[PDB]
Design a protein around this ligand. Structure first.
Ligand SMILES: CC(=O)N[C@@H]1[C@@H](O[C@H]2O[C@H](CO)[C@H](O[C@H]3O[C@H](CO[C@@H]4O[C@@H](C)[C@H](O)[C@@H](O)[C@H]4O)[C@@H](O)[C@H](O)[C@H]3O)[C@H](O[C@@H]3O[C@H](CO)[C@@H](O)[C@H](O)[C@H]3NC(C)=O)[C@H]2O)[C@H](O)[C@@H](CO[C@H]2O[C@H](CO)[C@@H](O)[C@H](O)[C@H]2O)O[C@@H]1O
Ligand SMILES: CC(=O)N[C@@H]1[C@@H](O[C@H]2O[C@H](CO)[C@H](O[C@H]3O[C@H](CO[C@@H]4O[C@@H](C)[C@H](O)[C@@H](O)[C@H]4O)[C@@H](O)[C@H](O)[C@H]3O)[C@H](O[C@@H]3O[C@H](CO)[C@@H](O)[C@H](O)[C@H]3NC(C)=O)[C@H]2O)[C@H](O)[C@@H](CO[C@H]2O[C@H](CO)[C@@H](O)[C@H](O)[C@H]2O)O[C@@H]1O
Ligand SMILES: CC(=O)N[C@@H]1[C@@H](O[C@H]2O[C@H](CO)[C@H](O[C@H]3O[C@H](CO[C@@H]4O[C@@H](C)[C@H](O)[C@@H](O)[C@H]4O)[C@@H](O)[C@H](O)[C@H]3O)[C@H](O[C@@H]3O[C@H](CO)[C@@H](O)[C@H](O)[C@H]3NC(C)=O)[C@H]2O)[C@H](O)[C@@H](CO[C@H]2O[C@H](CO)[C@@H](O)[C@H](O)[C@H]2O)O[C@@H]1O
Ligand code: NA
Ligand code: NA
Ligand code: NA
Ligand code: NA
Ligand code: NA
Ligand code: NA
Ligand code: NA
Ligand code: NA
Ligand code: NA
Lengths: 596, 596, 596
């Protein structure tokens, strides 16, 4: 009996009944201890003696044994104990080897990480993916991972090691073909990695989430090719209430916080500092196998960001046999700013970017039905390369309502570069244009419409302070066709502007172009006393349907017309009044109108 | 001693002190084991031998015994262990029998559901409510449930069974008269039920929440009368970050995700697919006992939905002695679409519905102070039955600002049906009207104002692309009174429209009606050389306060007036200019204005 | 052996191996029990006998011993057991004595509070801070607190005791110089305290959060000087999904729910009832040591509130050597109302308040780049003291877009009081002005511009119903300079108003002032048959650039001009038409325009 009690079966001979309740099960101590499980239950030598974790101990085989066994019982939760640092020091074997995997995750087996998990220097200058849910080196032949949750107050520490080569990949958690999986509460820190977490595989997966996690200093070298902290590659999945911070210069050029790459995905309530980019919202044709060729129901809401490049990047692209499409997107409630930096020292600053594909093509995209509403954007006055939207690829629709944009440009694309075909671009009058860049805009157009064509578009410009440095409020080059569109410039703060709207190809004359903007016009009257016509000197107003005075009349003896219409020769004409006769000659500020 | 150790009191004789700390309590093993409790502690036969759960074992009495005992100690948390499926196979007894209850919940007794709970076929074709917090068959005589939380990674599975009769009710969790209760993390799946979760009873309760839950395939038959996944029937309560999915055809006609039925309630950050409806926002007079007759502070925000009927349904109604009122509502940040379906194949598609009461009455409602802002809505081009608002019952106010609506109608009600009395309907110019249904609108009015009367309303129509198929942008039948209102149609994309605004009863002439819209007008001048009047042929403009040209003047020898006013006979008149004399006759596009 | 087994080392001699797995560690029962720890492990007398908690037992020394020991092992989580009330009855010692501290928190030592913690009457009429993370009486010489989380379903109860003197301070949790600390799930209730929770110290700290907590009845006496439930005094920190309720009259005058006092902080998704105020958003120069002199990236979103004073209060101030600045703020998606109360019975009601510093100074502030969008506000019709913004101190910018404000005033400041210098105030036309206070506004200006000066501002007034009781829609006193601004009053619902816009100093004549508003004007014509001038009687229109008719013409024999311009003497002039000659005399409603 003494022998049995001191044996490993001893707890199995000591009886227990809950709180001495005579209606409760007559159990043994071992039964109650078996209700939980920790790493300590597997972290032992071949004789069963516990092994203490530390920098000179590789915990990997023990944690895999724990996961393997619990999986064999239908699942449960393994605790990684608090107050210890558990090091990993070798690669895993089998199906995760193809993924440079360390630990293989299994279905229904959760990890409650309370302590620290820390990579040993075996991993310096090597690729690695710490937790992998694929069960095959080829993801197309992998089984699924289901019902796998990682959570707790603990930490995954990537050891600070730099990438050995740019072509290497590194990851924290790759759930794989993942269904009902999640990461909650965990701090990922101190590395040079490609991603911290990836959800799904090429549309396969569902109901995967990252919640209340922290991501700190996960890019550190010039070798790192590219970084996105969370890649969402399955539908009905998202990121909420997370914290992302980088301190490295390289992060300001390469790093993005989130990628939303399948339908019904979201990014909410998070804070970002030190990153190049906020979120990619993309349908890659090459990723369309699991959930279709459309990314729709995409939501970026209520985030706080300090970035160096672009906040939201929209895109879609094609392969030889698949075409990707992006539609039904909402971007709302975000507060974003470009951090302090020299002009042109990072990727062009933007709130929205319509980005060309990975080969630079601008003619592959199918992006439409996007709503950008209720956001703030700010860039410091020196940052020339800052825009509400950089529209660099073909666009089939994007709607802006009730935003506050305070940056160098409202709409921009570089001349000479891409020539996007633009449809259904809507810039409502409720967008407020800030004044930070007033006086900085010599030679520049606030809306610089450097496109192949614009159709079914609305641009309602409203200033809220003067900026007499800008060349124009909106400019269309002669190469940009314009049709079935509405372009207006409100008069407030424009009285002293040389140019307000500029149509280099006289595109405002098109049959279905609706415009209005201020202009200075010289007029001369006939000499008749009484009601008397006034006519413009210049003859470039054949497109004008009506015009009206924006100027006071300093004269007593006459008044020019309050309103005007045109004539076939392109003059403006209206009826004023000569109290006394005489030829009159005046220069008036007019609101020019066409079909509005 | 050997006997005592092997007895159920054995753990009570084995000493323990935490980590060998000499300052810690000298306890016994049983004391430490007593700090937790699981189903295994009650899942035993009359001799105390543990019983293994399975399809042929009814776990119900054991789980009730666990809850009853823990309740007797002031509460705690019972674990339902992972790696096992616990079946329920009989009805509960006592106060929950009136509710077809299975398990009775008790105050301060939480359930950590890590495994699976699964209904046995005893329940096929029968009513049931799995967890019930009432303690009496009559809810009015029930005590309260307080401080009861259900949480974990586990599952409640309803066994797939169909309803036996439409009059039956089925539920997952009915908290009852519930205060500080919640469901977090749980998957509810595989059933034909009326609700998954209900919070509160007729306004009694507070601080009840459903967070991070999943609801999958909970309608499956033509017998199911009606389904709402979560019914919120107490104040200061809500639903956040949940996932709702249905696959059944019947769900597209009957199922709603949430009901917000008391004040200070919310529905946020959730994803919905396959449902008829998103949320009811309602004050039923019949439910007003616990928290008053007003539903106020109602919040529907930041959700993602694919539905087949209506996204938000507003209503209030009366009983013989109580009148319900709905006010102070916000609907914001939602991205919603009607899924692919034939026209008229499901309940009329809508973003907002003002719905008649359960007996079809449209004259009982008191709905006001509602803000609908910053939302997107889309319906495919074939879905005739799609509207930004179906306004089908009396409305005392609703405000639309900065939404993007892309569907067949903006405002609709069916003619010949209800004749709502409308007050304080505000449709701000910042609402963007999409183009998906361009060319589909033969015979139809984009704003079809099929009401008894409209007062204190604003409709500012702005198109963003052409749709020459529509009969009009806005139409008032002669039966609809219109007063103290503002109705405008912006000219952009309207030059080729036959009709823009239509007032079948000439209602735009009312003393306090403020309007503007485009119209084509034929004019003829006098023959005088010089300043010369032009007059409309037609005499239906006695209501016009001013008009101005929307057309160019192709003539050299004359120009028509830029602006016009009227005369008592209903002609328009203005002063143009004949360079050379002659009677002139022109057809001009004008902006007609009344008091604006 | 019997002796060893019954000794406190007995569990250390009973062997265990997990689930009889021969690959698992050969452990002892004590090893597995040592994986968790509770208060019971320290709640014992000097002989090691457990002590039962209760009203006559002071648990403080035992809980401190638990925290101290766990800290010595690198941390972990202590459970405060369910089903017991643990009383605290004495002050702590050492570094927390300076803070009237009870329990000292330590790094990596979490508290899972499942039971109740309750203050004994030793604390009646005394100061106290229940949990303190400082380790020194002087916060400047304190070390940090890191990785400390308090969570669970339990309760902190402040015993109901009133403050003994107004100068006393009371707190629930002061994390101190706190990094990665949080409170989740806890109910704080039944007290008279200054704060429930404070995060950070004068900018020192990071990543501190309060989530899913309840705060109930935490002010109860006239002695309580001031209350803010959560004070956020470190960056990258915030409050989400919490519930705040007060019932005391004194709370309606003194209590605020949240203070956001450092950069990158947030307040989201919460419900508030019974409070004076919703949130302070402030940069105090005196708090700028840890994170700089700027509060930026401040977010108040998606909250529900019933308050008695002001929802959001903006401010910044200076010390002898530091100047505080507030910028980049977003207030969005909130639904707020002033509760039922007499006019002037609580602090002036407001959605936004621009508040003077604690000494009443209005000339110290630097507040700019604020966006207020997509909110609802309501105040009952009797509450004279209700405003969308009380602008009481110097303002460098604030933007309003697409809100719904339903209260007495839109913009207000009291005359004779402060004279703020105002820049970059933007009130977009998409703001909807409700009608609740129609007929209540005798003697009052809806926008009462009681400022020293206004520059670079926009006010676009749009009514949605009539209120002929108001003196004016917008009024500038002669003492208020106005320049480089845009002020418009839409005509809808204004035909019967005596005054629309009022410029007591004729400020609308300034060179860069852009205005438009309705006015009644008397005109007289010359007697000439045919085209004939009409001139205003009055000569106060030298500022007018154009005007147009808002009235119909009831005459057959003539028509007045549709449009007008001015003359140097300040008359208006335009060209009408006399079919028959005669001097005409008419009174017309005109839209007066200046540079628009
Ligand atoms: C870091 C990042 O995510 N960057 C975005 C771009 O992603 C693209 O480049 C990445 C570079 O790291 C990835 O490619 C790399 O990894 C591939 C996947 O690894 C293989 O498969 C894994 C399952 C195994 O575990 C690995 O062992 C390995 O076998 C690899 O095939 C590539 O060769 C390599 O360079 C990224 O790849 C995706 O990764 C996710 C996450 O792991 C995975 O779920 C997907 O299966 C995988 N996709 C593909 C197609 O392989 C790859 O997509 C991203 O393209 C870009 C988007 O913006 C651009 O394109 C837009 C749309 O046209 C346009 O609007 C915009 O302007 C463009 O800039 O954004 C980041 O740069
Ligand atoms: C499924 C659903 O919720 N549908 C909404 C309508 O709800 C109404 O019908 C339901 C049909 O299932 C419920 O009625 C049924 O259940 C009743 C309650 O069961 C009793 O009481 C429970 C406490 C016991 O546990 C049970 O054992 C039983 O005794 C029953 O009395 C009815 O006879 C039965 O048909 C639903 O009832 C409510 O249920 C909640 C949740 O359990 C409960 O808290 C309430 O006490 C109970 N209320 C009442 C009054 O009994 C009942 O409300 C809903 O009416 C509709 C709203 O839209 C319509 O009305 C709007 C306002 O006028 C109008 O704008 C809109 O256009 C209309 O369509 O929405 C769903 O259909
Ligand atoms: C209750 C509250 O928070 N009210 C807001 C005002 O806060 C200011 O008054 C408070 C009154 O309770 C605090 O001052 C009191 O407490 C001080 C701190 O206690 C000391 O330090 C602690 C660390 C120790 O633990 C204590 O033992 C003690 O030694 C004390 O020095 C003061 O003497 C005392 O009256 C509040 O103080 C802050 O408290 C936080 C939280 O604990 C702490 O982190 C900070 O270090 C501490 N700050 C300072 C400067 O001491 C003090 O700030 C608040 O000022 C007001 C803001 O609105 C006004 O000002 C705006 C900007 O100009 C203006 O826009 C607006 O119109 C104004 O009304 O809001 C609440 O009233
Ligand atoms: Na690979
Ligand atoms: Na859109
Ligand atoms: Na072109
Ligand atoms: Na019943
Ligand atoms: Na409203
Ligand atoms: Na009628
Ligand atoms: Na102190
Ligand atoms: Na702003
Ligand atoms: Na002044």
């Amino acid at each position: 009996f003494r022998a049995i009690i001191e044996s490993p079966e001893g707890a199995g001979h000591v009886g227990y009944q809950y709180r001495r309740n005579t209606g409760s099960t007559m159990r043994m101590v071992s039964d109650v201890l078996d209700e939980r499980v920790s790493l300590w239950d597997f972290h032992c030598d071949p004789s069963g003696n516990v092994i203490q974790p530390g920098p000179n101990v590789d915990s990997r085989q023990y944690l895999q044994a724990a996961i393997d066994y619990v999986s064999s019982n239908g699942g449960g939760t393994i605790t990684i104990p608090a107050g210890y640092t558990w090091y990993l020091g070798s690669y895993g074997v089998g199906g995760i080897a193809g993924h440079s995997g360390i630990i293989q995750l299994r279905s229904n087996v959760n990890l409650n990480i309370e302590g620290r998990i820390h990579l040993s220097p075996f991993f310096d200058l090597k690729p690695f993916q710490v937790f992998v849910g694929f069960d095959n080196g080829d993801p197309a032949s992998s089984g699924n991972l289901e019902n796998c949750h990682i959570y707790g107050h603990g930490v995954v520490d990537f050891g600070g090691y730099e990438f050995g080569a740019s072509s290497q990949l590194r990851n924290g958690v790759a759930f794989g073909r993942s269904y009902n999986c999640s990461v909650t509460g965990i701090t990922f820190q101190n590395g040079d990695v490609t991603w911290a977490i990836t959800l799904g595989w090429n549309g396969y997966g569902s109901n995967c989430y990252v919640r209340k996690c922290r991501f700190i200093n996960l890019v550190n070298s010039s070798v790192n090719a590219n970084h996105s902290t969370v890649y969402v590659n399955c539908p009905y999945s998202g990121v909420e209430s997370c914290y992302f911070s980088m301190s490295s210069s390289f992060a300001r050029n390469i790093a993005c916080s989130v990628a939303l790459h399948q339908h019904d995905t979201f990014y909410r309530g998070s804070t970002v500092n030190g990153y190049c980019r906020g979120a990619y919202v993309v349908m890659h044709a090459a990723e369309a196998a699991g959930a279709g060729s459309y990314a729709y129901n995409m939501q970026v809401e209520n985030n706080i960001a300090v970035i160096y490049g672009q906040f939201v990047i929209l895109g879609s692209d094609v392969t030889a046999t698949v075409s990707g499409h992006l539609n039904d997107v909402i971007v709302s409630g975000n507060i974003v700013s470009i951090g302090e930096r020299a002009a042109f020292s990072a990727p062009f600053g933007a709130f929205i970017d319509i980005g060309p594909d990975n080969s630079g093509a601008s003619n592959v995209q199918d992006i439409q039905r996007v709503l950008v509403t209720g956001n703030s954007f700010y860039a410091p006055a020196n940052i020339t390369d800052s825009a509400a939207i950089t529209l660099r690829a073909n666009l089939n629709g994007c709607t802006f309502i009730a935003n506050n944009f305070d940056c160098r440009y409202m709409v921009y694309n570089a001349p000479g570069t891409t020539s996007p075909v633009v449809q259904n671009l809507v810039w409502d009058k409720s967008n407020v244009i800030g004044g930070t860049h007033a006086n900085q805009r010599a030679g520049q157009n606030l809306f610089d419409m450097q496109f192949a064509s614009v159709v079914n578009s609305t641009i309602e410009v409203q200033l809220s302070c003067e900026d007499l440095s800008m060349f124009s409020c909106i400019l269309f080059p002669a190469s940009c066709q314009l049709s079935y569109s509405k372009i207006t410039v409100d008069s407030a703060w424009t009285k002293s502007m040389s140019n307000t709207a500029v149509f280099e190809g006289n595109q405002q004359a098109g049959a279905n172009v609706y415009v209005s903007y201020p202009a200075t016009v010289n007029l001369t009257s006939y000499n008749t006393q009484g009601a008397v016509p006034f006519f413009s000197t210049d003859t470039n107003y054949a497109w004008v349907t009506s015009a009206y005075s924006l100027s006071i009349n300093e004269n007593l003896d006459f008044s020019p017309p309050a309103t005007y219409t045109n004539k076939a020769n392109g003059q403006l004409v209206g009826v004023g009044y000569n109290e006394i006769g005489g030829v009159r000659s005046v220069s008036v500020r007019l609101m020019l109108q066409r079909q509005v």
